[PDB]
Amino acid sequence: LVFFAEDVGSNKGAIIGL
């Protein structure tokens, strides 16, 4: 429904590294 629940799996920590 949203994007947070999906984004929380990677977030800044993973999106910055990867």
Concatenated DSSP letters of 1-18: --SHHHHTTTHHHHHHH-
Name the amino acid, one letter, at 2.
V
Q: Which residue has the tokens 């947070």?
A: 4
Asked if residues 6 and 14 have their Cβ atoms less than 8 Å apart, the reply is no
Asked if residues 17 and 9 have their Cβ atoms less than 8 Å apart, the reply is no
3-11: which pairs have CB atoms within 8 A and are 24 or more residues apart? none
Experimental method: NMR
> Number of C-alpha atoms within 13 angstroms, CB side, residue 2?
4
Give the separation between CA 18 and CA 7, rounded to whole angstroms: 13
> Number of C-alpha atoms within 13 angstroms, CB side, residue 3?
1
Cα 16-14-11 angle, rounded to 5 deg: 95
